[PDB]
From Swiss-Prot:
Gene3D superfamilies: 3.20.170.30, RNA 2'-phosphotransferase, Tpt1/KptA family, N-terminal domain. Removes the 2'-phosphate from RNA via an intermediate in which the phosphate is ADP-ribosylated by NAD followed by a presumed transesterification to release the RNA and generate ADP-ribose 1''-2''-cyclic phosphate (APPR>P). May function as an ADP-ribosylase. HAMAP family: KptA. The keyword NAD applies. GO terms for biological process: tRNA splicing, via endonucleolytic cleavage and ligation. This is Probable RNA 2'-phosphotransferase. It comes from Thermococcus kodakarensis (strain ATCC BAA-918 / JCM 12380 / KOD1). InterPro entries: Ptrans_KptA/Tpt1 (IPR002745), RNA_2'-PTrans_C (IPR042081), RNA_2'-PTrans_KptA (IPR022928), RNA_2'-PTrans_N (IPR042080). Its EC number is 2.7.1.-. Transmembrane segments: none annotated. GO terms for molecular function: NAD+ poly-ADP-ribosyltransferase activity; tRNA 2'-phosphotransferase activity. Coiled coil: none annotated. Pfam families: PTS_2-RNA (PF01885). Keywords: NAD, Transferase.
Length: 179
């Protein structure tokens, strides 16, 4: 039971908080592959197996985790943006992202590409978009994102709680500048 508890706590950290310090990239719903999670756990606890994780999941008294096929997620408590139920934002016309002036040349040429995760996050609220960017640098530049542009190229936009939205990427065509 001690081994189950220390492994469980580490799964909670990986699955809710920082999958990128283990090289993992969750999908929009928060899932990573089970084999990747096992390999990640094994770097701290070499005895972990996929069968051990399945038992932790199925015996968890709180419903912390969900396995769907060969993928696994935490069901709650995330501190990075997820769309747990794949809920589409069909109504937003404009979305916003704040970029420090430093990353302006690459962002303008590339758009917003997924780096740490499988998707990028933006906001419906321009002030909240600016605040997010300030945490990443000074002299933040507002990107205005045409959501209908995004949908025309097949990028579904997902609700991720309150004003946050996620999308696989934002091509440069969908972006214009503002203060
Ligand atoms: O068997 C276990 C015991 C705890 N945990 C989670 O490890 C953190 C431990 O914090 P604690 O022990 O002070 O409560 C916390 O996760 P957090 O840092 O995301 O809040 C908790 O999650 P929970 O009990 O709230 O579900 C787990 O996964 N499995």
């Amino acid at each position: 039971k001690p081994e189950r508890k220390r492994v469980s706590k580490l799964m909670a950290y990986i699955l809710r908080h920082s999958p990128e310090e283990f090289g993992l990239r969750p999908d929009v719903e928060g899932f990573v592959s089970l084999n990747e999670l096992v390999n990640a756990l094994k770097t701290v606890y070499p005895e972990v197996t996929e069968e051990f994780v399945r038992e932790i999941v199925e015996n968890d008294p709180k419903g912390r985790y969900e396995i769907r096929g060969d993928r696994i997620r935490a069901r709650y408590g995330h501190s990075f943006p997820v769309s747990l139920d794949h809920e589409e934002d069909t109504e937003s016309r404009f979305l916003y992202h704040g970029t420090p002036r430093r990353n302006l040349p690459s962002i303008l040429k590339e758009g917003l590409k997924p780096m740490k995760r499988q998707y990028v996050h933006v906001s419906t609220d321009k002030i909240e978009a600016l605040e997010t960017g300030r945490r990443h640098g000074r002299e933040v530049v507002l990107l205005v994102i045409d959501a209908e542009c995004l949908r025309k190229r097949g990028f579904k936009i997902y609700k991720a709680g309150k004003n946050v939205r996620i999308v696989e990427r934002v091509p440069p065509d969908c972006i214009t500048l503002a203060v």
